Amino acid sequence: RPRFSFSIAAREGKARTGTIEMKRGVIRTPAFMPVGTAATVKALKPETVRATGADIILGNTYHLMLRPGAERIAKLGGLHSFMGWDRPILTDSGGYQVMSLSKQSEEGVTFKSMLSPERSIEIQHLLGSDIVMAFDECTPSRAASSMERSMRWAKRSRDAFDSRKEQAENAALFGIQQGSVFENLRQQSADALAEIGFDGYAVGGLAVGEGQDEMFRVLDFSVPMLPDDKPHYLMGVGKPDDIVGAVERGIDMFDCVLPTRSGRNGQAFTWDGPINIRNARFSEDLKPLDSECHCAVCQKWSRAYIHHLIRAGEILGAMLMTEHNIAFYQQLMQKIRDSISEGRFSQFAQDFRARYFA
Amino acid sequence: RPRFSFSIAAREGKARTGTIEMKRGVIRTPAFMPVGTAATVKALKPETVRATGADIILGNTYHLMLRPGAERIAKLGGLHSFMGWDRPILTDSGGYQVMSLSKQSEEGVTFKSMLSPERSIEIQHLLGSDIVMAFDECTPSRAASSMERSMRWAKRSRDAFDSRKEQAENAALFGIQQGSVFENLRQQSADALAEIGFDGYAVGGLAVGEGQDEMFRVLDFSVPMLPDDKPHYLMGVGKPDDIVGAVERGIDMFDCVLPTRSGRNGQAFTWDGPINIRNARFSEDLKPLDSECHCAVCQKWSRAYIHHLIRAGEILGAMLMTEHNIAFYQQLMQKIRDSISEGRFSQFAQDFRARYFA
Numbered sequence A, B: 001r002p003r004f005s006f007s008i009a010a011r012e013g014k015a016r017t018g019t020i021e022m023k024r025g026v027i028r029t030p031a032f033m034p035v036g037t038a039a040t041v042k043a044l045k046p047e048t049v050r051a052t053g054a055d056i057i058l059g060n061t062y063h064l065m066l067r068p069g070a071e072r073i074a075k076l077g078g079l080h081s082f083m084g085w086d087r088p089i090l091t092d093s094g095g096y097q098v099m100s101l102s103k104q105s106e107e108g109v110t111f112k113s114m115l116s117p118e119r120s121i122e123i124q125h126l127l128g129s130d131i132v133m134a135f136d137e138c139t140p141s142r143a144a145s146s147m148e149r150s151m152r153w154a155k156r157s158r159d160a161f162d163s164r165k166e167q168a169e170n171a172a173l174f175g176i177q178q179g180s181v182f183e184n185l186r187q188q189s190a191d192a193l194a195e196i197g198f199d200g201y202a203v204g205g206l207a208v209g210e211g212q213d214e215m216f217r218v219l220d221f222s223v224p225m226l227p228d229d230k231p232h233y234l235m236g237v238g239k240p241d242d243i244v245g246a247v248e249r250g251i252d253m254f255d256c257v258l259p260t261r262s263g264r265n266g267q268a269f270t271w272d273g274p275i276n277i278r279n280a281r282f283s284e285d286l287k288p289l290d291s292e293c294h295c296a297v298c299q300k301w302s303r304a305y306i307h308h309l310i311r312a313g314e315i316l317g318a319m320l321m322t323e324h325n326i327a328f329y330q331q332l333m334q335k336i337r338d339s340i341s342e343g344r345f346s347q348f349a350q351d352f353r354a355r356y357f358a
C-alpha cells in the first residue's frame, strides 16, 4: 500500500475525479470527510460512518489535546484503535480552533481552554493521523502578515514532520493557503507552499462568513495557483451547493460539521433542499426523509417517526437524522464523481441546482 | 402462529423456564423487556435491541397517548410500524404513570400532563399492542380500597378487550395483582383476578421503594396465589439481583428502565457488579466493560474510550453503555433460562450472588 498516491482518473473543466491511496485505505475524490470532533462522529458508530460510504474522517487536534490528551491517546494505542475507525484520518492542526474557541507569537499561540507548529505536528504524530495539517493562523497589510507567519509555520511544520521518520514514511502532510480574499497574497502563499512542497494543498480562510458569491470568486483565482497534480482541500465547507460549486472550481476534498450538527438540530438534506423535520407539516408524513435516498434510515423510518423523535429530544432522533445526512452527503459526492468521470458534471451541477433551490 | 401459548419446559423449585408463543414472535421465559418509553428504546435502533437478544419490548400508554397520540399512531399504521419493531410489544395501561407523573373516581382518573379502563384498553388497541395490561390504581383499610377498585377496573378491562374482536383474537390480556404488602389482600386480589380469567398475571405495587428483603417477602406468598399455568410478571423490577431472586420465587417476566437509564448515566453492569464508567480509574483501562460479555460493544471498545465518551457528554457514549447494559441483562436471562432447564439454577443464583456482590 502506498503512503500517499493521488491519481486523477478523469477531468471536466476544472473538476477532477480520482483516488488517493494510503496505507489504511483508498480515498475517492471528490471526497467528503465527516467530522469526528472528540474522537467520535457524533451519534454514529464508525461502522455506520463507513456504511454511508465515507472513506476518511476528520479529527480535531485542539479538542483531543485537551480531552483525553494526545499522549494518553498514544498510550492507548492511537486514535484509530481508541475510536475503532481503521481507515484514514485527517487531523486539523488546531490553528483555527485555538483562535475562535478560546497569547500569539512567532513561536506560536499560547492559550486558555503553548501550541506551536512543532508541537502541533507532535500531537498529530501521537494521535497517529494519516493526513497531518500544517500549523497555521486565522485588511491587506494584515492579511499578508498573517499569511506570512503561516508560511513560516508551514516550513516549521514541514521540517518537524520530516524529522519524525515514523511519520514521514506512513503519513502525508498538507499545506494551507491563506491570504484572505486577495489574489496577490493568495499567489504569494501558493508560491511559498509550492516551494516547500506538500502532499496536498488546502485553501484556508474561506470558512468565515464571507458568503458563497465571494467564496467562489476567491476560489476562482486561488485554486489554479495550487499544484495541479496534488489534491486540493477546502477546509470547513459546506452546504451541498457550496460543494458542487467548489468542485466546479477544482476542489477535491471537503469537511463540514453541517450534516452532523444540522441533523441533531432537526435539519435534513434532500435533493429538493433541506427540510426541518420538526415542522408540523411532517407529523403524519409516512414518506422517508428523501424519496431517492438509499440510506438505511430512508429504507426503514418515516418522516413522521423522526419528527416525533426529534420533538421529544430522543437520542434515536439524532442518530437517524445524522446517519441520513452523512449518507446524503456521500451520495452527493458519488454523483459528483460519476458525473465527472462520465463527462456530464456540468449538466449535473445545473440539474442539481435547479431541483435543490426549487 | 398462536395468539398466546405459554408452555413451561422445565422447573426448579418455584422457578420456571419456557416460552410464550404469539403471532408476532416467541418469548423466552424468564424474559426481560427493554422499556421503549416514547416509541423508542432510548439510544438504540430496534435491530440493535433485537441483536441483544430481546424477544419483546415495553411501551408506555400514558406517554404515547400524549405524544404523538394513540389515534395518530393508529393512523400511521400502529406502534410496530411506526417505530420499526415487528416483534411483541407489551403496553402498560397508564395507571402507574398517571399518578406518579402528573381527579380520581370509580369512573377512572382525570388528569393534567380522562383515562378509564375502557379508554386505556382502547388506546392500547389503537397502538396495536400484543400484550395489553389491565387498567389499575397505585394502610390495610386503604390497601383494600385501592386493590378493590383495581379489581373492579380489571373486570372493566376484561370486557372492554373482549368487546373488541380484533383485539381478542390477536392480543393477550394481563391482570395486575395489588394489595400492598398484605397477604390477605394479595390473596383477595388473586382470587378476583383468577375468577375473571387472564392470559397472564402481574404483581403490581412492588416497584415502590420497599427494599428487596420486603419485596422478596411479599413475592414469597404472593406468586403462589397466582394461577401456576400462566406467566407471572413483576412490573418495574429490577437490578440483576432482584431479577434472580424474583425468578427463584416464580416470576417469568420483567421490565425496568434501569439498564437504559443507568447506562446513559454512566453505570455499567458486570458479573462482578456495576461500575461507574466515569470514575477516573477507567481513564486508561483497555479492557471491555465486562471481560465475559459477548455484546458488540465489548468486542470493539474499551472502558477508556467509553469513559472519554460519557465524560464528554457524547451521544455515542450513551449508545454504547445502553447496548452493553441491555445485552448484559439478556445474557443474564439466558443464563437463568439455561440453568433452570439444566436443573442447576439454585447453584447459579448462589454463584451469581457471590461474584456480583463481591
Ligand SMILES: Nc1nc2[nH]cnc2c(=O)[nH]1
Pocket: A092, A093, A094, A095, A096, A133, A136, A138, A176, A203, A204, A205, A206, A207, A235, A236
Ligand atoms: N487549520 C485551519 N482549519 C480551518 N477550518 C476551516 N478553515 C480553516 C483554516 O483556515 N485553517
Ligand SMILES: Nc1nc2[nH]cnc2c(=O)[nH]1
Pocket: B092, B093, B094, B095, B096, B133, B136, B138, B176, B203, B204, B205, B206, B207, B235, B236
Ligand atoms: N400499571 C402498573 N405499572 C407498574 N409499574 C410498576 N409497577 C406497576 C403497577 O403496579 N402497575
Ligand SMILES: [Zn+2]
Pocket: A289, A290, A293, A294, A295, A296, A297, A298, A299, A324, A325, A327, A328
Ligand atoms: Zn436517507
Ligand SMILES: [Zn+2]
Pocket: B289, B290, B293, B294, B295, B296, B297, B298, B299, B324, B325, B327, B328
Ligand atoms: Zn458488553
